[PDB]
Symmetry: C2
Subunit: 450 residues, 2 copies
């Protein structure tokens, strides 16, 4: 059975035939359901055609680092031939071209099998806010998949695909990783192009990577990353930003003061986080305590501040003319921006800038920040019953990252007694993606039998 990239690379080297792997994969999805993990699938014939084109180019000696690798794509991102519903039964647009990032992956030989489910318009951190059926934690169907990038995460964790693309604004590229024992690479803003992505908050959005390991996540990120002159929020990076680097024998890492950490009654998660702190200490880290307040306050501006208006801006016309196709919880949130003024926005911007300035005190004393990815997980039923508050709780340690222009990577940090996984997130400054990935990888692999 095929799991990670290496397992596909080994199979192809041993002579397998990618066309059989893909046909088998499609078959396996058919005997199961499409929903709730998949909103649509690239027809088998188009997939095999895309593969044949890749084959021909490989045969001409072209370099194809992701040859014959199937992947899922969150349905807010364009794939040519498939509608981009973005988890909404009335947004009907079918793009002529691949999104800039998908194009680079297909250029490297990868094959996008289909579009994955999500919280509608990427507004949510749990995965229940969809009309296409509710995706579920792979470790227990009763619990939420997480994330916004819900189906993208499940499709990797259940073994269907070795990677997938998510997006991350508030934490949608990380929450679902944590709940499904995956790696979630959230690149620095502008490292990945936003062309062919239906925006949520355009100034904050990042297409993101979901995989089983950091190497795989990195392998994909290197291909996906790159400057897109047509995307005004695209930035230039280079090999420097996603390069792996060995960490010095001693370093500093920041953790919010133990006494004020927020786990919303989840004692096991608290203890598992403490394990993670120790483990990093044993790898040479000195734990620096800091006051989380300014980070919390900034995180709060995403939904309790004017940035909600970026979502309304992105779908203004649809919210005005056809509010009925919006998921009711998503609707109320997005339409609440109607009451936010230009003055409110700039005061939010001034406030944010003050919080960034306060936060510099912490960054000056650390090389990386370590947070729980999600403080606790919830059941589907509990989330449906309390869909705003419980969702906001999941965003306690995520929602400030893009606002403050940071890099993040979410990695596994073990399991609860009941089998449900728990994840931590390493956070660095802009363009420190490779650095933090390197530490995250060393963390996963200490003390990990090969």
């Amino acid at each position: 059975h095929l799991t990670d990239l290496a397992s596909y690379q080994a199979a192809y080297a041993a002579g397998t035939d990618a066309a059989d792997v893909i046909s088998d994969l499609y078959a396996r999805i058919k005997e199961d359901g499409e929903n709730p993990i998949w909103i649509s699938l690239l027809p088998l014939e188009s997939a095999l055609a895309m593969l044949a084109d890749a084959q021909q180019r490989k045969d001409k000696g072209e370099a194809l680092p992701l040859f014959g690798i199937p992947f899922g794509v969150k349905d807010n991102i364009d794939v040519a031939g498939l509608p981009t519903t973005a988890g909404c039964t009335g947004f009907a647009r079918t793009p002529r071209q691949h999104a800039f990032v998908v194009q680079r992956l297909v250029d490297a030989g990868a094959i996008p099998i289909g579009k994955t489910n999500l919280d509608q318009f990427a507004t949510g951190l749990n995965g229940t806010r969809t009309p296409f059926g509710i995706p579920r934690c792979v470790f227990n169907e009763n619990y939420v998949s997480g994330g916004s990038s819900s189906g993208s995460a499940v499709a990797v964790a259940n073994g269907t695909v070795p990677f997938s693309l998510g997006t991350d604004t508030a934490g949608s590229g990380r929450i679902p990783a944590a709940f499904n024992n995956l790696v979630g690479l959230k690149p620095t803003k502008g490292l990945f192009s936003g062309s062919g992505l239906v925006p949520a908050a355009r100034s904050l959005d990042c297409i993101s990577v979901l995989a089983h390991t950091v190497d795989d996540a990195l392998a994909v990120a290197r291909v996906a990353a790159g400057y897109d002159a047509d995307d005004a929020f695209s930035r230039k990076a280079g090999a420097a930003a996603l390069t792996e680097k060995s960490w010095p024998r001693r370093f500093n890492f920041g953790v919010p003061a133990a006494e004020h950490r927020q786990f919303f009654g989840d004692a096991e998660a608290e203890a598992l986080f403490n394990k993670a702190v120790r483990k990093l200490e044993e790898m040479g880290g000195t734990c620096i305590s800091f006051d989380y307040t300014p980070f919390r306050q900034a995180a709060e501006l995403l939904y309790a501040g004017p940035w909600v208006a970026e979502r309304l801006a992105a779908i203004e016309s649809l919210a005005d003319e056809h509010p009925e196709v919006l998921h009711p919880v998503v609707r109320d949130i997005i339409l609440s921006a109607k009451r936010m003024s230009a003055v409110d926005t700039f005061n939010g911007i001034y406030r944010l800038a003050d919080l960034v300035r306060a936060a510099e005190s912490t960054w000056e004393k650390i090389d990386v920040m370590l947070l729980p990815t999600a403080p606790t997980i919830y059941t589907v039923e509990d989330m449906l019953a309390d869909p705003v508050r419980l969702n906001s709780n999941l965003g306690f340690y995520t929602n400030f990252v893009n606002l403050m222009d940071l890099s993040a990577i979410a990695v596994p940090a073990g399991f609860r007694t009941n089998g449900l996984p728990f994840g931590v997130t390493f956070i660095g400054r802009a363009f420190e993606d490779g650095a933090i990935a390197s530490l995250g990888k060393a963390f996963v692999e200490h003390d990990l039998a090969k």
Copy 2:
């Protein structure tokens, strides 16, 4: 007149206390208004000077010892009210603004507060209830600028420098009209603490002087990181270092077909002289599409950034709109109708324009523009106060939005004696570089 003339006089043995007392006398024997809103009492000034003297006597470093300056009345000076050109804006600060503090620390003495376009909203100087300051080269014409009295007070010989502010072009227009140098520093190079904001994300305290050296001398003292100002940035070392320019360089000028002088033929010809002169200094003139720069400039007042002004004075606009100058009032209160969605769409639009503009920056080392395309009479401006003012902003209003450095320097005179200025524009933190070129332009 200039700094050197004070440094020479003090070296030759003149007492600063007599220079200051004489200066105060000269202001009294003439008018306070329309150039000055407030005057630091003579006794407080002399006291501040004595404190400087004591420190100099203990061997202290004081590069601006005994130099008087004016301060635009949107900037805090301890002891004096900060009116911002408003008769009902109460605010008398405990402390000097961060920038003013650094200047006092270097031995300078702020004589008083200068007149302005109310809440720094205007590029001409008529939008005030404290009397209308005038072009020194002809009373019939506008002083310019927003930083109106700060410019007149320097050009009229009263003080060797002054502080202005610049959001749309208020640190440059008045320089151009009064044959002065206007140094607009990169955003965040100077602290914004103790400044009444106009557009907080764009505002820059600015320097007005007779020469680039003087402007630079002041800027070096004023510049610096202020941890309490969330928009303050670290630059230091070179950012204000004066190199000298290579034998050959590229400079950008907007395409002849899109240049805009609003019927002022003499200004057009004087700009052409300025282009030729820079060519003769080794510059290759690169033509570029002004499009995105014009479009970005337009977002300042035709876009959501007007809302930064309303945010800054929201309480006063809500409770006491009557103390606002009527033209300023209508502009600022129009932001009431701008939404959060409008703002982010403006931000997205701006980012596209910045991206288009990179094509030009990639081809040039510096941009050269007319500072002001023309100049107007006070009468004409009063009669058409929105449109004619907007015209003055044609080549200025994009600079802060696009995060640029600028220095406005003289470029000669019209047949009728009215001066004309150009502005050198560079990227963020290229302040020293551009100043160096501007200086070489004024001289060779």
